[PDB]
Write an enzyme that holds these catalytic residues in place. Sequence first.
Site, PDB file in Angstrom:
ATOM      1  N   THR A 268      -9.564   6.473 -18.626  1.00  0.00           N
ATOM      2  CA  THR A 268      -8.188   6.988 -18.738  1.00  0.00           C
ATOM      3  C   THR A 268      -7.535   6.416 -19.982  1.00  0.00           C
ATOM      4  O   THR A 268      -6.959   7.181 -20.758  1.00  0.00           O
ATOM      5  CB  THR A 268      -7.364   6.618 -17.503  1.00  0.00           C
ATOM      6  N   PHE A 393       0.719   9.301 -14.277  1.00  0.00           N
ATOM      7  CA  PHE A 393       0.359   8.085 -13.509  1.00  0.00           C
ATOM      8  C   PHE A 393       0.513   8.314 -12.010  1.00  0.00           C
ATOM      9  O   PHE A 393       0.590   7.347 -11.240  1.00  0.00           O
ATOM     10  CB  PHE A 393       1.181   6.893 -13.998  1.00  0.00           C
ATOM     11  N   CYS A 400      -0.109   4.814 -10.264  1.00  0.00           N
ATOM     12  CA  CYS A 400      -0.976   3.882 -11.004  1.00  0.00           C
ATOM     13  C   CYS A 400      -0.366   2.481 -11.062  1.00  0.00           C
ATOM     14  O   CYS A 400       0.681   2.272 -11.682  1.00  0.00           O
ATOM     15  CB  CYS A 400      -1.154   4.399 -12.410  1.00  0.00           C
TER      16      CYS A 400
HETATM   17  C1  HEM Z   1      -6.209  -0.770 -17.320  1.00  0.00           C
HETATM   18  C2  HEM Z   1      -5.745   0.432 -16.993  1.00  0.00           C
HETATM   19  C3  HEM Z   1      -5.536   0.920 -15.610  1.00  0.00           C
HETATM   20  C4  HEM Z   1      -5.709   0.299 -14.408  1.00  0.00           C
HETATM   21  C5  HEM Z   1      -6.151  -1.122 -14.157  1.00  0.00           C
HETATM   22  C6  HEM Z   1      -5.369   1.256 -13.381  1.00  0.00           C
HETATM   23  C7  HEM Z   1      -5.444   0.980 -11.999  1.00  0.00           C
HETATM   24  C8  HEM Z   1      -5.112   1.867 -10.991  1.00  0.00           C
HETATM   25  C9  HEM Z   1      -5.066   1.566  -9.602  1.00  0.00           C
HETATM   26  C10 HEM Z   1      -5.472   0.253  -8.969  1.00  0.00           C
HETATM   27  C11 HEM Z   1      -4.611   2.686  -8.949  1.00  0.00           C
HETATM   28  C12 HEM Z   1      -4.385   2.784  -7.459  1.00  0.00           C
HETATM   29  C13 HEM Z   1      -2.938   2.342  -7.105  1.00  0.00           C
HETATM   30  C14 HEM Z   1      -2.691   2.420  -5.619  1.00  0.00           C
HETATM   31  O1  HEM Z   1      -2.953   3.486  -5.019  1.00  0.00           O
HETATM   32  O2  HEM Z   1      -2.267   1.418  -4.999  1.00  0.00           O
HETATM   33  C15 HEM Z   1      -4.404   3.694  -9.941  1.00  0.00           C
HETATM   34  C16 HEM Z   1      -3.961   4.990  -9.664  1.00  0.00           C
HETATM   35  C17 HEM Z   1      -3.820   5.964 -10.658  1.00  0.00           C
HETATM   36  N1  HEM Z   1      -3.962   5.779 -11.994  1.00  0.00           N
HETATM   37 FE1  HEM Z   1      -4.402   4.140 -12.975  1.00  0.00          FE
HETATM   38  N2  HEM Z   1      -5.022   2.413 -13.963  1.00  0.00           N
HETATM   39  C18 HEM Z   1      -5.097   2.301 -15.293  1.00  0.00           C
HETATM   40  C19 HEM Z   1      -4.856   3.259 -16.289  1.00  0.00           C
HETATM   41  C20 HEM Z   1      -4.536   4.594 -16.022  1.00  0.00           C
HETATM   42  C21 HEM Z   1      -4.250   5.577 -16.989  1.00  0.00           C
HETATM   43  C22 HEM Z   1      -4.272   5.367 -18.484  1.00  0.00           C
HETATM   44  C23 HEM Z   1      -3.934   6.738 -16.293  1.00  0.00           C
HETATM   45  C24 HEM Z   1      -3.585   8.082 -16.790  1.00  0.00           C
HETATM   46  C25 HEM Z   1      -3.471   8.423 -18.060  1.00  0.00           C
HETATM   47  C26 HEM Z   1      -4.050   6.448 -14.898  1.00  0.00           C
HETATM   48  C27 HEM Z   1      -3.764   7.337 -13.879  1.00  0.00           C
HETATM   49  C28 HEM Z   1      -3.715   6.995 -12.536  1.00  0.00           C
HETATM   50  C29 HEM Z   1      -3.382   8.001 -11.510  1.00  0.00           C
HETATM   51  C30 HEM Z   1      -3.070   9.467 -11.728  1.00  0.00           C
HETATM   52  C31 HEM Z   1      -3.435   7.354 -10.328  1.00  0.00           C
HETATM   53  C32 HEM Z   1      -3.170   7.955  -8.955  1.00  0.00           C
HETATM   54  C33 HEM Z   1      -4.456   8.482  -8.319  1.00  0.00           C
HETATM   55  C34 HEM Z   1      -4.267   9.260  -7.035  1.00  0.00           C
HETATM   56  O3  HEM Z   1      -3.130   9.629  -6.647  1.00  0.00           O
HETATM   57  O4  HEM Z   1      -5.307   9.517  -6.366  1.00  0.00           O
HETATM   58  N3  HEM Z   1      -4.423   5.135 -14.762  1.00  0.00           N
HETATM   59  N4  HEM Z   1      -4.693   3.181 -11.213  1.00  0.00           N
END
Ligand code: HEM
Length: 455
Positions: A268, A393, A400
Amino acid sequence: TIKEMPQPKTFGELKNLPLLNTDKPVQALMKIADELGEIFKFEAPGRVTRYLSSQRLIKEACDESRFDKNLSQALKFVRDFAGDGLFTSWTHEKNWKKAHNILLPSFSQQAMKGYHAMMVDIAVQLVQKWERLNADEHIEVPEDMTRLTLDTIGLCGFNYRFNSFYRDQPHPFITSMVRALDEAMNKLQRANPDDPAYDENKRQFQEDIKVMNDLVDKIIADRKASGEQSDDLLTHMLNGKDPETGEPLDDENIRYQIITFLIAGHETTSGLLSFALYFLVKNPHVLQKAAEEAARVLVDPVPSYKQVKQLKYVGMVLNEALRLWPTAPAFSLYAKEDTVLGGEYPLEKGDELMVLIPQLHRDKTIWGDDVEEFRPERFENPSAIPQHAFKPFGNGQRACIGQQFALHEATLVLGMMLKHFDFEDHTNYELDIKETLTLKPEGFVVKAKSKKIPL
Ligand code: HEM
Ligand SMILES: CC(C)C1=CC2=CC[C@@H]3[C@](C)(CCC[C@@]3(C)C(=O)N[C@@H](Cc3c[nH]c4ccccc34)C(=O)O)[C@H]2CC1
Ligand SMILES: [Mg+2]
């Protein structure tokens, strides 16, 4: 009035299933949304979901009293190695709320002050790599952005150096993780998964799970043994207690969180940087404005946390790249109770929705007619954006957790790139968006001419 939901073309008893038998399923769904509008039903043998594309309906899908996060089949396949980490857990699992409460303070904007120095370490390695290229050479953009984001998460996550800039063949952990992710995604299109052709896939998958578990379990055990306190998320998880239950995370769940940070964050974030640089080289006036900001703000050899916060136009560039090509392009929801969506579409308890984020981000009722144009200035007055129009996000308590980390990383790195180099689209690159776990501009290459500014 109750409305009949549009549905794309069918294949007899396979219903809509063959539409996702394609290299580029998100881009295929976006074309279906262009033809059918803000909502369409998608049926396959034994399953139905509804793809949403409009701010009007996604605003309602984002109501946490009515809808909760669903695990897509994609997330269920990833759960075989991400376990009950935050990304692949149901909201109702005890380990979701425990880890959420423990980890939120370690992912805040304020917490980024503590990760900044480690992020700079890897960012300087990228800049030095490009400073050291010869005249005849080019940059493989997604490849280098992925080396950077993997190494940054590894160093800030558990004080582990994958040393991706020292290698052609990644660290074995990364080879196993990328191969496990590839296998999880490949299973979405696999008609006969118990065919002997997949015996090697199943063996390799178990081997790759063991490689990931063995390294991360060892580093957790090494850390607990030494008592050493570092500026990493592993220190925070070893020290943390959930205020609600009063319990810490157990060592198995800590391992799943570390694997999760690498899975959820690496591609991502690298895709965001890759698409941002793609849009900048295709829009030279925007690149010039972003480069002028980087030169004015980044006045020291080493960027500071405070300086990254003043890269406002760089932040707008990143938001506009997330608007057009959000690199986690969909998420899944279920109805908590029977409810009516948009005054028109009755849903039963348990009915699923998919949010098609790239299509949401092209809603002309929100953004105006120029939706395909890369215009960062559309983020200048964000209070004017209606609720739930911009969702790269995700949503609510299941949004996220890494958002501040991803944006700090990306703003720092893009700022340094724009300070240190002029860029040339030397091949007149034709955008080709490859779909895996994520979206990326496949084969995007540039040349970087040093401005010869010391680090
Ligand atoms: C080091 C970078 C990142 C880490 C460590 C990270 C970590 C996570 C974690 C742990 C979740 C789950 C949160 C929860 O449900 O409690 C999550 C969800 C999500 N992240 Fe990230 N993330 C990162 C970068 C990104 C980026 C750059 C994007 C988009 C451009 C992104 C999009 C999302 C989305 C859309 C979800 C929701 C997924 C869903 O509803 O099923 N993430 N992320
Ligand atoms: C792990 C995270 C980062 C990801 C989340 C995703 C969510 C939606 C996905 C995804 C974009 C991959 C392509 C299919 C799509 C759009 C989807 O609707 N998929 C539905 C519907 C579906 C497609 N094929 C299936 C096979 C069986 C069951 C359901 C399906 C699903 O996965 O549930 C996919 C990318 C990876
Ligand atoms: Mg092909």
